[PDB]
Amino acid sequence: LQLVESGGGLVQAGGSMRLSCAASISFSSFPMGWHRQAPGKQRELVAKTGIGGTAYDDSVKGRFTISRDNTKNTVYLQMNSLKVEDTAVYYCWGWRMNDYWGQGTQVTVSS
Amino acid sequence: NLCPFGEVFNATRFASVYAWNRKRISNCVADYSVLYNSASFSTFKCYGVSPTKLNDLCFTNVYADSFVIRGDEVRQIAPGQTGKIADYNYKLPDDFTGCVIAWNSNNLDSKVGGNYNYLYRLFRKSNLKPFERDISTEIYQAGSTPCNGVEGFNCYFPLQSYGFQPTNGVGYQPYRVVVLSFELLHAPATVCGP
């Protein structure tokens, strides 16, 4: 894999956590971001950023914040005010001619 | 019967300039006046042929090369030009005969959050020869130390994305380009005007 994720785990509702991702290839001028897949659901976009702009899924706006270090080809997802619905496998993502995916990191939010 | 100009000019997606498309157009009738009145072209010039006389001419074949670049780069699609596009992506010869046609495609090719599908080549060992195409993705060695498959400083994946977003300045907005080459062979013509 070219995308290596870190962070994740179990948190209570209202809590926070932070996902990290480092690429071993250059995504300069290309997008990096985060997708997630709930059990029995289709993988959907969480947030992405790049020279084309920053976009968030409507459900995470005001709670999740994506950031990116272009020099290290790293992308981060600060997840605040976690909700039970936020429970999913979170994937680091990039696109450079084809899709690149991380291993997938379990995020569990319970009350 | 009628030349399939619609397939080229109105394709839902265009090619990246580094992998510029070429469509061979043969055995058909071409009305270049209708084509001129087809859209609001910002560029529609010709070299070695008169535009207003295209409907009077017959050619052996016509080749339509099509791609997307940004506005500021449309000037490079011409004989005797230099720059990233002319040097590394799409090169016309000094004696080019044909027509260059370009129109703003911001409504079609830009997207909120970025459309990254259109790419260009930023690095190459040498300049392209006229009408050459390079679709390789080998890591470019810009320095003295060999890359050996590892990207880093002076070791670059050679393609970069335009990342068009809808509120870019017009020089950074996408423009669709069609270059028409009119081939004259010592054989019966297959593409004529009305």
Side-chain angles (χ1 to χ4, degrees), chain A residues 24-26 28-31 48-53 55 95-97, chain B residues 18 111-114 116-117 119 137 151 157 159-163 165:
Chain A
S24 54
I25 57 173
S26 177
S28 131
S29 77
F30 295 98
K48 67 181 178 180
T49 191
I51 64 170
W95 184 91
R96 194 178 80 173
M97 303 186 71
Chain B
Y18 87 96
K111 298 165 200 167
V112 176
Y116 296 88
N117 288 284
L119 315 177
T137 53
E151 301 180 29
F157 178 78
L159 303 184
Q160 293 290 87
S161 175
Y162 282 110
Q165 53 180 309

Short mmCIF file of all heavy atoms in Angstrom, two decimals, chain A residues 24-26 28-31 48-53 55 95-97, chain B residues 18 111-114 116-117 119 137 151 157 159-163 165:
data_model
loop_
_atom_site.label_atom_id
_atom_site.label_comp_id
_atom_site.label_asym_id
_atom_site.label_seq_id
_atom_site.Cartn_x
_atom_site.Cartn_y
_atom_site.Cartn_z
N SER A 24 3.54 7.33 0.58
CA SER A 24 4.90 7.10 0.11
C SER A 24 5.10 7.52 -1.34
O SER A 24 6.20 7.35 -1.88
CB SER A 24 5.27 5.62 0.29
OG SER A 24 4.33 4.77 -0.33
N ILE A 25 4.06 8.04 -1.98
CA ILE A 25 4.16 8.67 -3.29
C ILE A 25 3.67 10.11 -3.16
O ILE A 25 3.08 10.50 -2.15
CB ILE A 25 3.36 7.92 -4.37
CG1 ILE A 25 1.89 7.80 -3.96
CG2 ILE A 25 3.97 6.55 -4.63
CD1 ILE A 25 1.01 7.23 -5.05
N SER A 26 3.94 10.91 -4.19
CA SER A 26 3.60 12.33 -4.16
C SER A 26 2.20 12.54 -4.71
O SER A 26 1.90 12.12 -5.84
CB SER A 26 4.62 13.14 -4.96
OG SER A 26 4.26 14.51 -4.99
N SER A 28 1.13 15.74 -4.90
CA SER A 28 1.15 17.14 -5.27
C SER A 28 0.29 17.37 -6.51
O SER A 28 0.42 16.66 -7.50
CB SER A 28 2.60 17.59 -5.52
OG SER A 28 2.72 18.28 -6.75
N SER A 29 -0.59 18.37 -6.42
CA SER A 29 -1.63 18.74 -7.39
C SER A 29 -2.79 17.76 -7.41
O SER A 29 -3.78 18.01 -8.10
CB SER A 29 -1.09 18.90 -8.83
OG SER A 29 -0.85 17.65 -9.45
N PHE A 30 -2.73 16.67 -6.66
CA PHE A 30 -3.76 15.66 -6.60
C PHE A 30 -4.49 15.71 -5.26
O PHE A 30 -3.98 16.27 -4.29
CB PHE A 30 -3.15 14.27 -6.82
CG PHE A 30 -2.57 14.08 -8.20
CD1 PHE A 30 -1.21 14.22 -8.42
CD2 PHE A 30 -3.38 13.77 -9.28
CE1 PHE A 30 -0.67 14.05 -9.69
CE2 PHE A 30 -2.85 13.60 -10.55
CZ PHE A 30 -1.49 13.74 -10.75
N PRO A 31 -5.70 15.15 -5.18
CA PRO A 31 -6.44 15.20 -3.92
C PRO A 31 -6.08 14.08 -2.96
O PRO A 31 -5.73 12.96 -3.36
CB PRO A 31 -7.90 15.06 -4.39
CG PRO A 31 -7.80 14.17 -5.58
CD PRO A 31 -6.49 14.52 -6.25
N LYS A 48 -12.11 15.75 1.69
CA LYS A 48 -10.97 15.73 0.78
C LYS A 48 -10.47 17.15 0.61
O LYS A 48 -11.23 18.11 0.78
CB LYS A 48 -11.34 15.13 -0.59
CG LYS A 48 -12.31 15.97 -1.40
CD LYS A 48 -12.64 15.29 -2.72
CE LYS A 48 -13.65 16.10 -3.52
NZ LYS A 48 -13.97 15.44 -4.81
N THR A 49 -9.19 17.28 0.28
CA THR A 49 -8.61 18.60 0.07
C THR A 49 -7.49 18.50 -0.95
O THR A 49 -6.89 17.43 -1.16
CB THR A 49 -8.09 19.22 1.38
OG1 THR A 49 -7.75 20.60 1.16
CG2 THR A 49 -6.85 18.48 1.87
N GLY A 50 -7.21 19.62 -1.59
CA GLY A 50 -6.21 19.70 -2.63
C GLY A 50 -6.29 21.05 -3.32
O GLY A 50 -7.01 21.94 -2.87
N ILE A 51 -5.55 21.17 -4.43
CA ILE A 51 -5.56 22.43 -5.16
C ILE A 51 -6.93 22.72 -5.75
O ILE A 51 -7.22 23.87 -6.11
CB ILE A 51 -4.48 22.44 -6.26
CG1 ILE A 51 -4.78 21.38 -7.32
CG2 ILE A 51 -3.10 22.24 -5.66
CD1 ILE A 51 -3.90 21.48 -8.56
N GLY A 52 -7.79 21.71 -5.87
CA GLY A 52 -9.14 21.91 -6.34
C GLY A 52 -10.12 22.38 -5.29
O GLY A 52 -11.29 22.64 -5.62
N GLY A 53 -9.71 22.48 -4.04
CA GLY A 53 -10.60 22.88 -2.98
C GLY A 53 -10.77 21.88 -1.85
O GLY A 53 -10.15 20.85 -1.84
N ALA A 55 -13.70 19.74 0.36
CA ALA A 55 -15.11 19.43 0.44
C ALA A 55 -15.36 18.47 1.58
O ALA A 55 -14.54 17.59 1.86
CB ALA A 55 -15.62 18.82 -0.88
N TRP A 95 -6.11 10.16 -5.05
CA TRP A 95 -6.32 9.83 -6.45
C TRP A 95 -5.15 10.35 -7.26
O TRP A 95 -4.82 11.53 -7.18
CB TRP A 95 -7.63 10.40 -7.00
CG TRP A 95 -7.90 9.98 -8.42
CD1 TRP A 95 -8.60 8.88 -8.83
CD2 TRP A 95 -7.45 10.63 -9.62
NE1 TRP A 95 -8.62 8.82 -10.21
CE2 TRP A 95 -7.92 9.88 -10.71
CE3 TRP A 95 -6.70 11.79 -9.87
CZ2 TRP A 95 -7.67 10.25 -12.03
CZ3 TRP A 95 -6.44 12.14 -11.18
CH2 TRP A 95 -6.93 11.38 -12.25
N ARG A 96 -4.53 9.46 -8.03
CA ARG A 96 -3.47 9.85 -8.96
C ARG A 96 -3.54 8.87 -10.14
O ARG A 96 -2.89 7.82 -10.12
CB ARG A 96 -2.10 9.84 -8.30
CG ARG A 96 -1.03 10.55 -9.13
CD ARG A 96 0.31 10.58 -8.42
NE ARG A 96 1.04 9.32 -8.54
CZ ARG A 96 2.29 9.14 -8.12
NH1 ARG A 96 2.95 10.13 -7.55
NH2 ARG A 96 2.87 7.96 -8.28
N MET A 97 -4.34 9.24 -11.14
CA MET A 97 -4.75 8.40 -12.27
C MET A 97 -5.73 7.32 -11.82
O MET A 97 -6.73 7.07 -12.49
CB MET A 97 -3.55 7.78 -12.98
CG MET A 97 -2.55 8.80 -13.47
SD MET A 97 -1.24 8.05 -14.45
CE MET A 97 -2.15 7.61 -15.93
N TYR B 18 -1.64 15.31 -22.25
CA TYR B 18 -0.52 14.38 -22.40
C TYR B 18 -0.94 13.12 -23.15
O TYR B 18 -0.11 12.49 -23.81
CB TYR B 18 0.05 14.01 -21.03
CG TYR B 18 -0.64 12.84 -20.37
CD1 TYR B 18 -0.14 11.55 -20.49
CD2 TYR B 18 -1.81 13.02 -19.64
CE1 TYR B 18 -0.78 10.48 -19.90
CE2 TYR B 18 -2.45 11.96 -19.04
CZ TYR B 18 -1.93 10.69 -19.18
OH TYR B 18 -2.57 9.62 -18.58
N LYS B 111 -15.42 21.25 -11.47
CA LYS B 111 -16.34 20.73 -10.47
C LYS B 111 -16.00 21.31 -9.10
O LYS B 111 -14.84 21.58 -8.80
CB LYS B 111 -16.30 19.19 -10.38
CG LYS B 111 -16.70 18.47 -11.66
CD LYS B 111 -16.29 17.01 -11.61
CE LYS B 111 -16.24 16.41 -13.01
NZ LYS B 111 -15.54 15.09 -13.03
N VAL B 112 -17.04 21.51 -8.28
CA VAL B 112 -16.82 21.90 -6.89
C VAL B 112 -16.02 20.81 -6.19
O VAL B 112 -16.32 19.61 -6.32
CB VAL B 112 -18.16 22.15 -6.19
CG1 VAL B 112 -17.94 22.46 -4.71
CG2 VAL B 112 -18.91 23.28 -6.87
N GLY B 113 -15.00 21.21 -5.45
CA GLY B 113 -14.07 20.27 -4.86
C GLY B 113 -12.96 19.84 -5.79
O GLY B 113 -12.05 19.12 -5.36
N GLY B 114 -13.01 20.24 -7.06
CA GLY B 114 -11.95 19.94 -8.00
C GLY B 114 -12.26 18.79 -8.94
O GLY B 114 -12.73 17.74 -8.52
N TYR B 116 -9.94 16.57 -11.04
CA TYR B 116 -8.52 16.26 -11.18
C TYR B 116 -8.23 15.37 -12.38
O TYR B 116 -7.06 15.03 -12.61
CB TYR B 116 -7.99 15.60 -9.91
CG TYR B 116 -8.02 16.49 -8.68
CD1 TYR B 116 -9.15 16.55 -7.87
CD2 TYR B 116 -6.93 17.27 -8.33
CE1 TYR B 116 -9.18 17.35 -6.75
CE2 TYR B 116 -6.95 18.08 -7.21
CZ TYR B 116 -8.08 18.11 -6.42
OH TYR B 116 -8.11 18.92 -5.30
N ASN B 117 -9.24 15.00 -13.16
CA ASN B 117 -9.06 14.00 -14.21
C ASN B 117 -8.17 14.49 -15.35
O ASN B 117 -7.53 13.68 -16.02
CB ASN B 117 -10.42 13.56 -14.76
CG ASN B 117 -11.19 12.70 -13.78
OD1 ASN B 117 -10.89 11.52 -13.61
ND2 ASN B 117 -12.19 13.29 -13.13
N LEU B 119 -4.90 15.98 -16.83
CA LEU B 119 -3.50 15.99 -16.43
C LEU B 119 -2.64 16.60 -17.54
O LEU B 119 -3.06 16.70 -18.69
CB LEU B 119 -2.99 14.58 -16.12
CG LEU B 119 -3.88 13.67 -15.27
CD1 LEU B 119 -3.25 12.29 -15.14
CD2 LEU B 119 -4.13 14.28 -13.91
N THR B 137 4.72 7.05 -17.57
CA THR B 137 4.61 7.54 -16.21
C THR B 137 5.84 7.16 -15.39
O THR B 137 5.75 6.98 -14.17
CB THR B 137 3.34 7.02 -15.54
OG1 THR B 137 3.29 5.59 -15.65
CG2 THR B 137 2.10 7.62 -16.20
N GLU B 151 9.96 8.11 -5.24
CA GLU B 151 9.67 9.52 -5.45
C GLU B 151 10.21 10.36 -4.30
O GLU B 151 10.35 9.89 -3.17
CB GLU B 151 8.16 9.74 -5.60
CG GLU B 151 7.55 8.96 -6.76
CD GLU B 151 6.06 9.18 -6.90
OE1 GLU B 151 5.57 10.26 -6.52
OE2 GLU B 151 5.37 8.26 -7.39
N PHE B 157 7.10 11.79 -10.12
CA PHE B 157 6.03 11.34 -10.98
C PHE B 157 5.72 12.44 -11.99
O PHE B 157 5.41 13.57 -11.58
CB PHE B 157 4.79 11.00 -10.15
CG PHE B 157 3.60 10.55 -10.96
CD1 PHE B 157 3.54 9.26 -11.46
CD2 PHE B 157 2.55 11.41 -11.20
CE1 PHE B 157 2.45 8.84 -12.20
CE2 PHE B 157 1.45 11.00 -11.93
CZ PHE B 157 1.40 9.72 -12.43
N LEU B 159 3.50 13.49 -14.20
CA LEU B 159 2.23 14.12 -14.50
C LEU B 159 1.73 14.92 -13.30
O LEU B 159 1.97 14.56 -12.15
CB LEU B 159 1.18 13.09 -14.91
CG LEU B 159 1.52 12.18 -16.10
CD1 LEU B 159 0.34 11.28 -16.45
CD2 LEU B 159 1.97 12.99 -17.32
N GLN B 160 1.04 16.02 -13.60
CA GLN B 160 0.37 16.83 -12.59
C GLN B 160 -1.05 17.11 -13.06
O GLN B 160 -1.34 17.12 -14.26
CB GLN B 160 1.10 18.16 -12.34
CG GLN B 160 2.47 18.01 -11.69
CD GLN B 160 2.38 17.57 -10.23
OE1 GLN B 160 2.32 16.38 -9.94
NE2 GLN B 160 2.37 18.54 -9.33
N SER B 161 -1.94 17.33 -12.10
CA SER B 161 -3.34 17.57 -12.41
C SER B 161 -3.63 19.07 -12.47
O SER B 161 -3.04 19.87 -11.74
CB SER B 161 -4.25 16.91 -11.38
OG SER B 161 -5.60 17.26 -11.64
N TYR B 162 -4.56 19.43 -13.35
CA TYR B 162 -5.04 20.81 -13.40
C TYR B 162 -5.93 21.14 -12.21
O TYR B 162 -5.93 22.28 -11.73
CB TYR B 162 -5.81 21.05 -14.70
CG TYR B 162 -4.94 21.25 -15.92
CD1 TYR B 162 -4.87 20.28 -16.92
CD2 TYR B 162 -4.20 22.41 -16.08
CE1 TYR B 162 -4.08 20.47 -18.03
CE2 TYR B 162 -3.40 22.60 -17.19
CZ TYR B 162 -3.35 21.63 -18.16
OH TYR B 162 -2.56 21.83 -19.27
N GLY B 163 -6.70 20.16 -11.72
CA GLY B 163 -7.59 20.37 -10.59
C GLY B 163 -8.56 21.52 -10.79
O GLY B 163 -8.70 22.37 -9.90
N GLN B 165 -11.42 23.99 -10.71
CA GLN B 165 -12.58 24.31 -9.89
C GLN B 165 -13.30 25.52 -10.48
O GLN B 165 -12.67 26.39 -11.08
CB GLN B 165 -12.19 24.57 -8.43
CG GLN B 165 -11.12 25.62 -8.21
CD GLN B 165 -10.82 25.81 -6.73
OE1 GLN B 165 -11.72 26.02 -5.92
NE2 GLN B 165 -9.54 25.73 -6.37
#
